[PDB]
Amino acid sequence: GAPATVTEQGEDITSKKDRGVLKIVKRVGNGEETPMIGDKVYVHYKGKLSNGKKFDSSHDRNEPFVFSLGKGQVIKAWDIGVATMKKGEICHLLCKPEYAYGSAGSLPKIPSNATLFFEIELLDFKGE
Numbered sequence: 373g374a375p376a377t378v379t380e381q382g383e384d385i386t387s388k389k390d391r392g393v394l395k396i397v398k399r400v401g402n403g404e405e406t407p408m409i410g411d412k413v414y415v416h417y418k419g420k421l422s423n424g425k426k427f428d429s430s431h432d433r434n435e436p437f438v439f440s441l442g443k444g445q446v447i448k449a450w451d452i453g454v455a456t457m458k459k460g461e462i463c464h465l466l467c468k469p470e471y472a473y474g475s476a477g478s479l480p481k482i483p484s485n486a487t488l489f490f491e492i493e494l495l496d497f498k499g500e
């Protein structure tokens with residue numbers, strides 16, 4: 373399924389090149405600009421465990437998710453992944469546990485040692 377496709381085709385966007393965060397650009401966005409540290413970013417996302425089990429979707433709430441980029445306000449794979457995106461881009465991210473919730477998990481929805489899959493659409497971003 374989609375998580376295995378990221379394993380097979382994803383771009384390694386980690387500084388260490390350890391395959392910890394792999395990315396497929398599903399829809400190329402527009403403009404040259406990517407969001408910068410401290411920007412307010414707006415996304416829609418769907419999250420599942422790598423085995424396909426859904427844990428959350430902002431579409432179900434009709435509620436974009438908003439955060440400040442590059443400040444450790446979200447899991448490492450999101451700060452790394454969203455910084456590579458263009459406005460209007462849709463990507464798939466596969467995140468090894470060390471770039472997600474690691475040993476602690478996010479219990480009960482996310483177990484310890486979980487690889488996570490996210491679909492992310494970068495709706496907008498604005499300087500603080």
Ligand SMILES: CCC(C)(C)C(=O)C(=O)N1CCCC[C@H]1C(=O)O[C@H](CCc1ccc(OC)c(OC)c1)c1cccc(OCC(=O)O)c1
Pocket residue numbers: 417419427428429437444445446447448450472473474478481482
């Ligand atoms: C349980 C799964 C939830 C949390 C619902 C989920 O879908 C999810 O996994 N996320 C929500 C959308 C952004 C990615 C991801 C997320 O980062 O949520 C983070 C989880 C907490 C976290 C922050 C920083 C971290 O490292 C610097 C960190 O590492 C373990 C954990 C989160 C941020 C803000 C709000 C939030 O939940 C809603 C709330 O508390 O109101 C969850």
